Enzyme design. Structure first.
Site, PDB file in Angstrom:
ATOM      1  N   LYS A 162       0.843  -1.176   0.000  1.00 33.27           N
ATOM      2  CA  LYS A 162       0.000   0.000   0.000  1.00 33.27           C
ATOM      3  C   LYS A 162       0.888   1.238   0.000  1.00 33.27           C
ATOM      4  O   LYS A 162       1.922   1.276   0.704  1.00 33.27           O
ATOM      5  CB  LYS A 162      -0.993   0.029   1.177  1.00 33.27           C
ATOM      6  CG  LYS A 162      -2.085  -1.048   1.090  1.00 33.27           C
ATOM      7  CD  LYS A 162      -3.397  -0.624   1.748  1.00 33.27           C
ATOM      8  CE  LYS A 162      -4.588  -1.441   1.251  1.00 33.27           C
ATOM      9  NZ  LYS A 162      -4.857  -1.394  -0.239  1.00 33.27           N
ATOM     10  N   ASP A 192      -0.112  -0.677  -4.664  1.00 35.35           N
ATOM     11  CA  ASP A 192      -1.460  -0.152  -4.539  1.00 35.35           C
ATOM     12  C   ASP A 192      -1.501   1.310  -4.095  1.00 35.35           C
ATOM     13  O   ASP A 192      -1.289   1.626  -2.923  1.00 35.35           O
ATOM     14  CB  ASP A 192      -2.292  -1.022  -3.580  1.00 35.35           C
ATOM     15  CG  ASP A 192      -3.796  -0.722  -3.678  1.00 35.35           C
ATOM     16  OD1 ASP A 192      -4.186   0.344  -4.209  1.00 35.35           O
ATOM     17  OD2 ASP A 192      -4.608  -1.556  -3.215  1.00 35.35           O
ATOM     18  N   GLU A 217      -1.847  -1.074  -9.038  1.00 39.38           N
ATOM     19  CA  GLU A 217      -3.235  -1.262  -8.685  1.00 39.38           C
ATOM     20  C   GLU A 217      -3.875   0.065  -8.296  1.00 39.38           C
ATOM     21  O   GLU A 217      -3.393   0.750  -7.386  1.00 39.38           O
ATOM     22  CB  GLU A 217      -3.339  -2.234  -7.526  1.00 39.38           C
ATOM     23  CG  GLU A 217      -4.740  -2.546  -7.130  1.00 39.38           C
ATOM     24  CD  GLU A 217      -4.786  -3.471  -5.931  1.00 39.38           C
ATOM     25  OE1 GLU A 217      -3.759  -4.181  -5.662  1.00 39.38           O
ATOM     26  OE2 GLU A 217      -5.811  -3.407  -5.223  1.00 39.38           O
ATOM     27  N   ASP A 240      -9.244  -1.482  -9.072  1.00 39.51           N
ATOM     28  CA  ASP A 240      -9.806  -1.998  -7.816  1.00 39.51           C
ATOM     29  C   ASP A 240     -11.063  -1.171  -7.479  1.00 39.51           C
ATOM     30  O   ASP A 240     -12.170  -1.526  -7.914  1.00 39.51           O
ATOM     31  CB  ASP A 240      -8.750  -2.001  -6.699  1.00 39.51           C
ATOM     32  CG  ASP A 240      -9.249  -2.628  -5.385  1.00 39.51           C
ATOM     33  OD1 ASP A 240      -8.445  -2.708  -4.415  1.00 39.51           O
ATOM     34  OD2 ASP A 240     -10.423  -3.031  -5.281  1.00 39.51           O
ATOM     35  N   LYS A 264     -13.645  -7.061  -5.022  1.00 43.96           N
ATOM     36  CA  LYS A 264     -14.271  -7.288  -3.727  1.00 43.96           C
ATOM     37  C   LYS A 264     -15.693  -7.750  -3.909  1.00 43.96           C
ATOM     38  O   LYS A 264     -16.491  -7.140  -4.648  1.00 43.96           O
ATOM     39  CB  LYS A 264     -14.243  -6.014  -2.874  1.00 43.96           C
ATOM     40  CG  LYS A 264     -12.794  -5.607  -2.542  1.00 43.96           C
ATOM     41  CD  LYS A 264     -12.698  -4.373  -1.690  1.00 43.96           C
ATOM     42  CE  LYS A 264     -11.290  -4.166  -1.142  1.00 43.96           C
ATOM     43  NZ  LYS A 264     -10.312  -3.910  -2.245  1.00 43.96           N
ATOM     44  N   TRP A 319      -7.282 -12.342  -0.558  1.00 39.76           N
ATOM     45  CA  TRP A 319      -6.894 -11.625   0.644  1.00 39.76           C
ATOM     46  C   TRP A 319      -7.979 -11.811   1.684  1.00 39.76           C
ATOM     47  O   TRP A 319      -9.151 -11.736   1.358  1.00 39.76           O
ATOM     48  CB  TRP A 319      -6.693 -10.148   0.346  1.00 39.76           C
ATOM     49  CG  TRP A 319      -6.372  -9.331   1.543  1.00 39.76           C
ATOM     50  CD1 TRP A 319      -5.135  -9.045   2.036  1.00 39.76           C
ATOM     51  CD2 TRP A 319      -7.307  -8.684   2.404  1.00 39.76           C
ATOM     52  NE1 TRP A 319      -5.241  -8.254   3.163  1.00 39.76           N
ATOM     53  CE2 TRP A 319      -6.564  -8.008   3.406  1.00 39.76           C
ATOM     54  CE3 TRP A 319      -8.705  -8.594   2.424  1.00 39.76           C
ATOM     55  CZ2 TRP A 319      -7.177  -7.265   4.417  1.00 39.76           C
ATOM     56  CZ3 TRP A 319      -9.309  -7.854   3.426  1.00 39.76           C
ATOM     57  CH2 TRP A 319      -8.544  -7.207   4.416  1.00 39.76           C
TER      58      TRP A 319
HETATM   59 MG   LIG Z   1      -6.560  -2.156  -3.797  1.00 35.76          MG
END
Ligand SMILES: [Mg+2]
Ligand SMILES: [Mg+2]
Ligand SMILES: [Mg+2]
Ligand SMILES: [Mg+2]
Ligand SMILES: [Mg+2]
Ligand SMILES: [Mg+2]
Ligand SMILES: [Mg+2]
Ligand SMILES: [Mg+2]
Ligand SMILES: [Mg+2]
Ligand SMILES: [Mg+2]
EC number: 5.1.1.22
Lengths: 367, 374, 374, 367, 374
Positions: A162, A192, A217, A240, A264, A319
């Site tokens: 991240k 990300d 990402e 994403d 997600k 994840w």
């Molecule tokens: Mg992401």
């Protein structure tokens, strides 16, 4: 048919938190749990847990409010995916992340009725264990490099770093230090930006690092910004946060805007839509993750079941928030990452046995 | 500085309802009201009221839930638009329709502090009265043509015909009958598909009616569908439901996807964003409305203030729910459509005086770092 | 697990034939039937039947040859869709029309094991009966208009007029005569060029008939030709023959090349891929049919099950060969079009009971790692 | 006029096999042979041999089945290319790889009747020997580098390195090691992904290797994926598997999607269509190979004849399966690679004299 | 091998001239003839004849000058198409119209050596007779309509109306009058603007005449102008003058700029390139003509041979200058249009026997490495 719907919320403190993201750090999460009860008394569990209120257009209070509206009109609906979504869409526009929880619960109930795992209902598992990837929260470059090596040694096939909400120089430092730590181990790498980078800085991130094999990402804030950088970045680009519907995914895949997705379950609106998403990606040869925002055992089970049905060559990892969650809902059977991998449940439904009173009395119930 | 924030909800039954929409009909509406109280005791009012839960990604319970989050983090913040939006965006992603209500209240408070109408804070009214348009719910073609003439006769400069949730041939019948009733009167015509048409049927609607001068307002379900039909329809195309942010509007205007907009203050996230939208449309010579989903005097005042600042040749009309709302919040000053037009308020702030107890006790309140569920 | 696989072929003479197509007429058809036998003795049936050898890249001998390869490598595999397709794709590239037959049989077996209809396995039926459409073979314009009215009167919600293999002026005459016969009845109209028109003639067809509300179904020979005419035709355009995979469909839907699809289960490679296709069209608000090339009760059951899961407003109809097929495989439960509609089966699996010897001895069988030519 | 058509099949074990490809390895191949007999008793030979059943949409049993349909309606057709293709297309849609075998046989019969080599019928040879290229099956990076040098030393002008169905890291290792072995010899290099790479990995392959002068041959699975990577890869891109018709080639050439082609005679539907393809590439200055999937002497002859009519500057090489085939059909005259090059036959027709019983009794015969 | 090459010119006065074109009228034409002599004494004939010096980048003196260069470098070369073109391209860049004449002669020689017609060398004739089209010069609208009906009555399957070098309203009048005279006869119609229209006027031509089924043949002056009008004209568009090479044709076909072609053998550089063009159009399902600029029996034979190899549904016609040419080169075998159609020659080579002295002494000859100006 659905006889009753109960809603609950539950606190999930972040083990060794905060967990730090460009779009907003999180210290504790409030999950929203659904229990559907069929006319025969059998039950199915669902769950949705936004990663705080600024990651996406979603929040814990929003989940509960939406679920109240949905639950209030769902008695008598058939507990099958298409009838469920038909009824839900007649009651409330959008709110995929809320609808997701009821969708999960229906798949649990359906699998239990038929005596098969959810992975069977989703088309049949291709594997009995799935890969995962570890997400390094935003942290000092040195600490990231340290934790990267540690997680590679634990057995993770892929690492997500991240980045953002600080100067791009430091992000570039972080990714170079991570790469120096894990190069030659073969571990896959994602950078990300969590919507945190201007196109100026995303261009620089790629330009400076041709020999670091990351995928970028969601570097930038919007679909249009992804479109801006796409022809000017020689690194692969993943979507994403912008993947808010199957429609929008189709626009991105069909235009070859992206080389893959972080996806997600709650964002796309449940397993019914995630399985369509899976089939889209398979048709287009686009790798993707099998994630959700956050959650405990119910969410973990949902992700694991869908992940098991993906061609391993396209499955970038499931994840789970599980390492950051202190207590299982089902202590014996709740899914857990072991050696960077996850065992696929083989019992009926989601593979969970949760006490009907695990979360205390309902906050709301319909029928 | 904001000292306290109170939230309320209030029922608004539809006068002579229901009000019929392709994406879902409405019989009665729950509005969500915000009251901001400054450290000095002055109050500002805001409001947001979705047209039920299926017309947009918005519902009354969602407005309240989002406002609880926003309100909980706002005490101490400066009651100015940019500080407000910076704070709100740090507390909650999206939920423009909720943020809009706090934005409106801040503009009310700010105007009252400075002693000027909201339209001054928005750059200055260009007119003392604004045009409106009447929206015909989906109804039999013959009923539509009758009501169209009736509303033209009342003085409306523009008519929106709601269409869909039925075979396209019936929509085409309805637009033709309406046109036959009002042609020659000069009244402007919009055909609102309410996101309800396949591209198949949108193509047919335009193809069959070259000599009927409608604009097609949001005929199809997505931005991509608008992009599909744009090169294939010789009628003007307007965006409505898809205009969910300034970013998306800029994408549409910059690519000349549309010839104008139906715009709702709640959808774009309040007056601060509506003023930007207005300026973008002025730069691009794109006509637009100044609407909101529904509401009483607070929403109506907000819409009228922004509408007053638009060049009249680009202002397609400020639609108000007012004719469908039984009761004013402020019986003296609440805005009313008269002869198809609306008089611009001239008092400080929104130009309203509303009893602090008009909506009963609060459902929720925040003061400093504490909040209370009542 | 799959224990044994048997292959059969069966002749289906066309009732009152021939059935006339621009890409080639048919008098009689050889269907290829698959029977999968589970280790526990339960059976599932599948079927694939090209409309002769020139309508698509498919023929009866090719179905059998490909099924021999597939069958030879399938014993021991799990009778679940994703495991099946993974295995099939490892044995043979493409040949969707052959793979479809095994996919159907697997869905039959799976439903029978779990005690639920195929439509449940596909996500749940949204309706107990589905619409159909009637396909008029290429024929004199006057005969077409007569039969069009006749079939509208029977209750068909939609009519497909096959065109081509003759001057375009005759096709235009035929569509105009048909339209004159059925206009006002509300019946939907498709003009199927069967890949038979040059772009020259497709442009003319649309240009001359703005007030005839047809969709143009696969007017031209290639994807590129569809791309050529798309910006120049104000009638909706549907893809049929070019929709040879989910990938290609995504290319077309994503670029808004078409406004809908004629889709055949065999072409896309079975129910697993049809369900994905359905979900893609639902996301894009694109209408489509649920057809196959030809076949008896097994194909008809497959089409009806998937059709039942489509939102009725997007389901243009399930075309069946059933009216042209003399004999049912299952006389009790075989699907029949009644009043232009089809009742959805409710038994386990496809809802069929077919004698294991209905098609005679096998032509080919596989059990374990052995195969036998009979 | 065609009097009779006979079909045969014949096994071709892979000498020192398997021969290893991303889309599927092969151990032995089943070729399908056609003999056409004219009313005057003269004969022409044709052949088609898919590289197993998963390389392309083609298989040995499919060839035979299609050829049965074609053969059953071909008696009485004129043995000239346009009349033949007209009749074939009236009998069966598509199945280019089957139609190819009858097309080859007609060119053989036609050349024999007129007493000229097939290269004359195709417009006239420009050379009496043609270049070839060698295809390294997927193999260890070290072994590839070894074999690359060996084949350069044998005299091959060009080497194709098959890649994929393993991590991209190893493919990059392989191409670097090959390049290290042969750089400075001037040998041309192709990296063949055989549809095996995601766009993610094809982008990385090019990005990491700017100074390795490979062309990327069919890296990705679809035409749309080639379109995705084209603007983002600074290496030349060739189409192979996606070139399934002259129509599709025209789309690729006209849009400058590719810089060249691997082209197979069977994929495009015979010499009639290959010669049009040749003329297209000449007009557009696009290099191409002159290959087929697999086969023995008949296929080899067909490839060699068409290859001889290509401007040498555009002819990337005629690949032949011949080194992997143990026995010639015509022991004395069957074409063979010598010093990485192939001598062009100069006798009538394909230049073959094959015993009418070479393959045993017909499996099928029409008229 | 080519032993000797001789060049000639011959005058062809227009029968009942002039022949009127927008890019320039013609009264009489100078054709350039090539005779190739093989080492064995057999001869092949070729021909190229521009329609004066302003119709294309080509003229009679240029044909001769280019042929002198080509001829000077060709002795010893193999008389086969690919060897010929490789050699020619090494001697001179472009000048397709000159190269065409040598290409034709080589095909004649090659056919005569092998004892087969040129159409066999081109892959095999698909028909024993081919269609033609008649080209109406620019003339009064009323004269055009009269002659149109007259030529339809003779049996022509297609009519080309030459337009331009006058106000567009007169062209529109002419196409309408022609259409009124022949509508219902099924005759195909092309409107040839001869590169003469601005995009302004091309747009108007199409816009005003949706129900007149012409194709627009090269309405405008450039490739870019075709690109401009393409998205704005609902009539089919054909390329003619801009199709100056196979490369350019591939650019047009691949981008679907056009729906077909007028193609001239000399422009594309001979039969070798015409055969490639034919195959490209077959792959793309694009109709085309098989023409040349002008000429006698040698050019007419060349056009007829290639035309015979085109699928009749894609062959818009082989136009010949023959009706305007007073004298045959071969009185027995020279091709003639009869009833709007042309019988395909069946002798060896082009199917012509022409006296070696038919055109008088040579103007130029080459043998080995020497050349002679006579
Ligand atoms: Mg992401
Ligand atoms: Mg004032
Ligand atoms: Mg609207
Ligand atoms: Mg039911
Ligand atoms: Mg138009
Ligand atoms: Mg069709
Ligand atoms: Mg670059
Ligand atoms: Mg290759
Ligand atoms: Mg003949
Ligand atoms: Mg012309």
């Amino acid at each position: 048919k659905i006889a009753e719907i109960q809603l609950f919320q539950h606190d999930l403190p972040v083990v060794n938190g905060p967990y730090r993201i460009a779009s907003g750090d999180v210290w504790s999460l409030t999950t929203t749990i659904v229990k559907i009860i069929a006319e025969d008394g059998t039950i199915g569990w669902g769950e949705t847990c936004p990663v705080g209120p600024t990651y996406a257009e979603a929040h814990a209070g929003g989940a509960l409010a939406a679920l109240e509206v949905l639950a209030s009109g769902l008695a008598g609906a058939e507990a099958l995916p298409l009838p469920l979504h038909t009824r839900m869409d007649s009651l409330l526009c959008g709110h995929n992340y809320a609808k997701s929880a009821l969708d999960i619960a229906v798949h649990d109930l359906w699998g239990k009725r038929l005596g098969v795992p959810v992975h069977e209902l989703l088309g049949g598992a291709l594997t009995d264990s799935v890969s995962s990837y570890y997400s390094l929260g935003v942290m000092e470059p040195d600490e990231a490099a340290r934790q990267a090596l540690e997680k590679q040694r634990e057995g993770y096939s892929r690492l997500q770093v991240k980045l953002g909400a600080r100067p791009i120089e430091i992000d570039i430092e972080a990714i170079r230090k991570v790469w120096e730590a894990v190069r030659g181990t073969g571990i896959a790498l994602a950078a990300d930006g969590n919507r945190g980078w201007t196109t100026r800085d995303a261009l620089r991130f790629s330009r400076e690092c041709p020999d670091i094999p990351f995928v970028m990402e969601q570097p930038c804030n919007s679909f249009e910004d992804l479109e801006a950088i796409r022809p000017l970045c020689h690194h692969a680009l993943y979507m994403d946060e912008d993947g808010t519907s199957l429609n929008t995914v189709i626009t991105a895949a069909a235009t070859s805007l992206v080389d893959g997705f972080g996806m997600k379950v709650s964002r796309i609106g449940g397993l019914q839509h995630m399985r369509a998403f899976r089939d889209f990606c398979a048709a287009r040869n686009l790798p993707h993750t099998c994630d959700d925002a956050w959650g405990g055992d119910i969410v973990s089970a949902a992700c694991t079941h869908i992940a098991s049905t993906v061609l391993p060559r396209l499955m970038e990892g499931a994840w789970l928030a599980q390492p950051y969650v202190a207590e299982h809902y089902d202590a014996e059977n709740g899914v857990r990452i072991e050696g960077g991998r996850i065992r696929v449940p083989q019992g009926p439904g989601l593979g969970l046995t949760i006490d009907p009173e695990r979360f205390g009395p309902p906050l709301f119930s319909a029928e």
